[PDB]
Symmetry: D2
Subunit: 129 residues, 4 copies
Amino acid sequence: TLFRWPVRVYYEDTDAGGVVYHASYVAFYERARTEMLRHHHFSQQALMAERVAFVVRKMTVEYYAPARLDDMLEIQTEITSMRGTSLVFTQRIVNAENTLLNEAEVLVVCVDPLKMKPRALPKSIVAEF
Amino acid sequence: MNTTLFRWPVRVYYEDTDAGGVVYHASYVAFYERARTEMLRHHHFSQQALMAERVAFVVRKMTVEYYAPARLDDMLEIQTEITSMRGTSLVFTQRIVNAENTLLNEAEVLVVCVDPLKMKPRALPKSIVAEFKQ
Amino acid sequence: TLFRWPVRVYYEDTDAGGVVYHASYVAFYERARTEMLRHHHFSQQALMAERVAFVVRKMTVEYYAPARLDDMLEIQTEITSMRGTSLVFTQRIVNAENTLLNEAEVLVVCVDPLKMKPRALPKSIVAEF
Amino acid sequence: TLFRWPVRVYYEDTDAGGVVYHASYVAFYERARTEMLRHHHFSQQALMAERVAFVVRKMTVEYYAPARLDDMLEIQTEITSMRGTSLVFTQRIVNAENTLLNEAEVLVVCVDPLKMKPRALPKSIVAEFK
Ligand SMILES: CC(C)(COP(=O)(O)OP(=O)(O)OC[C@H]1O[C@@H](n2cnc3c(N)ncnc32)[C@H](O)[C@@H]1OP(=O)(O)O)[C@@H](O)C(=O)NCCC(=O)NCCS
Ligand SMILES: CC(C)(COP(=O)(O)OP(=O)(O)OC[C@H]1O[C@@H](n2cnc3c(N)ncnc32)[C@H](O)[C@@H]1OP(=O)(O)O)[C@@H](O)C(=O)NCCC(=O)NCCS
């Protein structure tokens, strides 16, 4: 199921190349994942107060086309695969003209911070997705 | 393909950390960018200068594999090789190790040479090809 | 007239202390100024074609209380001063409980982005302010 | 005593205007303070042993001239004042030609990471600096 999250491009996100810095896309993707979780009632640091957190294990990003200042982007997020301790988010970004700017596949592993050891996924999250 | 490994040190500062107590995963991406830039600089090329010559380098595809976390005040070494080279693009193989030489993570980066103000692929400058010819 | 802009704290804005990095606040302030100008139909990628920009000349931030991950903040922004070439933004950040986290006074100069020289303010900006 | 710290400008620090994003300077200044303390063996490790953290109370930055991609800058840092639970950093940034790009005055409060209330400056710190 698809979750959509709007993102405005600000000066902070751009570089001297006249486009969005390639790492800023990575941050945009994280917000989208965060907001999708929130859409299913989750708060990631009150959730780390119960010592459960999410870390990125692997990420593959393809940049097809650039975003620019004040572009209103849409980040699209899906959970495509689920295992015992990890999640696979399939994500993509489009602009106002529905041009496909880029897309990412993010392997996220459920850990808990003070150990950051792979912990089994919370039972509630399994029920949701 | 000039195989020689280029090494670049990076100190982890507060700005690179998150509430999790480790380095933010996008900061690794910037660290990789810095090392590629320094590798180019070591071979006598400035991207600021190349910009006005209508030459820029943009990331087309990037794969990052996070094995182990970096923390505040760690002194890291970014390692950078060019493994593939084509007309308008080339492939970087990079990885990050800490002081104990623990492999923190590694990346493969596809960089494309473009004309920044029209954002279309262009042949790598001959002098850059010359430096990484072999 | 006061202008309000909501901002969500994400992982990207936090540091190892578990609170928002103080430079992230600076970025938040910039967003609000941009959105404030936008609200008066003053977009800045549109005007860079027009070779006109707003660069920060002086910024003073005073910090009182911290913000944490997933906090929904509010940036309050008002223009308090104006001269032929410059203008002053008075800004502050509060949290959901209306606690004052910090405040900033930002001096901004209108310049040409080519040689970066001080130009006089567009008579339309001084009009709607 | 003046402490110098080099900082290279990268793409990450720049914006679409072709110059360094004004917030990137704030981070540069912190690195320099961090490195200044490190020079006197006051590493984060040393601070945690004192259970001491440093937070910014007030900061005034003055932007005079822009830095650009590939500029090698120098951050110049000095402690100009020290009081009970705080101390004032005076910082400047110059380029390779020693042109003054911008400067900052940073009031830093000595806090306690438990809680972050004012804590008296460590004896070693007040003795290390004058
Ligand atoms: C690098 C770049 C110029 C390569 O141009 P290219 O020769 O068209 O390369 P590709 O064909 O492999 O691009 C893949 C697809 O994106 C399309 N594309 C390229 N530039 C585009 C643009 N400006 N707008 C919309 N689509 C674009 C391509 O047509 C292609 O379509 P298809 O595979 O579905 O048929 C282009 O992909 C690009 O601008 N990527 C974004 C770079 C970036 O911003 N990186 C982050 C900052 S470093
Ligand atoms: C996510 C993580 C807990 C995976 O758990 P895992 O049990 O090690 O599972 P994996 O099989 O994927 O391990 C991958 C490799 O990383 C190594 N590794 C994991 N944690 C390590 C550590 N703390 N120190 C050194 N190596 C470590 C593993 O040994 C493994 O290498 P190997 O083939 O020699 O065994 C761990 O790899 C990790 O912490 N990665 C970094 C996460 C991160 O910092 N992301 C950025 C912030 S979100």
